[PDB]
A paper describes a structure:
Five crystal structures of two representative and phylogenetically distant phytopathogenic fungal CDAs, [name] from [name] and Pst_13661 from Puccinia striiformis f. sp. tritici, were obtained in ligand-free and inhibitor-bound forms.
Gao et al. showed that the cotton root pathogen [name] secretes a CDA ([name]) that is specifically localized to fungus-host interfaces. [name] prevents CO-induced immune response reactive oxygen species (ROS) production, MAPK phosphorylation, and resistance-related gene expression. [name] and Pst_13661 are single-domain enzymes with 55% sequence similarity. In the structure of [name], the signature Asp-His-His triad (formed by Asp56, His108 and His112) and a water molecule were coordinate with a metal ion. Kinetic studies also indicated that both [name] and Pst_13661 used the Zn2+ ion instead of the Ni2+ ion for their higher activity. The mutant VdPDA1D55A, H201A, which completely lost its deacetylase activity, was constructed.
Numbering used by the authors: 35 to 246
Write the structure that this text describes.
């Protein structure tokens, strides 16, 4: 896998990656329990401070890492990265790294730009930092709070699009959309794995430990 190149699709056959942005927050524990009860893994792109704060979810963050879900970076506090200087972009990343390594010991090598906002200057910062940049190809539009519409968009797009974007900070996403997504995955007999696994990259490459 290349660094600093937007990645849109899974490549490993039979695979699906349910991914979740903007957490952790008060519903994430619920979401993780749902995935584990069904034998599935999730990929969670977290912020340092947004809805919740990393330091308030240490046990959850530890189990996410130890149980082989995938933690990715969603920057420290969710700005439009194209509206920042290259130095502040880098600090949006390393600030997140430094807080995760202090609480659970690891920091990620995968990220998703907030609002999918990035240009050639954002990507070179990501390439210098060694990050895989994960977009998506199935947008559930779950932030509109239209659950019938979201569940239907998932069902219509799941055959060809396997990097599924949701936001686990919204109660409706966790209590309504996610059960519908898990059930449809079970019907289609797909393997709900992490984004790295769905790209052919195993656990040893999702994190770094030694500080920069
Ligand atoms: Zn976001």
């Amino acid at each position: 896998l290349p660094n600093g190149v937007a990645i849109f699709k899974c490549t490993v056959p039979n695979t699906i990656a349910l991914t979740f942005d903007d957490g952790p927050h008060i519903w994430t524990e619920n979401a993780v329990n749902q995935l584990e009860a069904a034998g599935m893994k999730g990929t969670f792109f977290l912020n340092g401070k947004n809805f919740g704060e990393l330091k308030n979810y240490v046990p959850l963050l530890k189990r996410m890492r130890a149980n082989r879900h995938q933690i990715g970076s969603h920057t420290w506090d969710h700005p439009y990265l194209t509206q920042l200087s290259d130095a502040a972009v880098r600090k949006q990343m390393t600030d997140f790294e430094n807080e995760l390594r202090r609480l659970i010991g690891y920091y990620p090598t995968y990220m998703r730009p907030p609002y999918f906002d990035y240009n050639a200057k954002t990507l070179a910062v990501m390439k210098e930092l060694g990050y895989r940049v994960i977009h998506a190809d199935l947008d559930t539009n779950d932030w509109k709070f239209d659950m019938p519409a979201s569940i239907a968009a998932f069902k219509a797009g799941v055959a060809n699009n396997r990097i599924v974007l949701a936001h686990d900070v919204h109660e409706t996403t966790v209590k309504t959309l996610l059960p519908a997504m898990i059930k449809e995955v079970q019907r289609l007999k797909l393997k709900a794995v992490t984004v790295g696994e769905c790209l052919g990259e195993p656990y040893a490459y999702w994190y770094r430990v030694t500080p920069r």
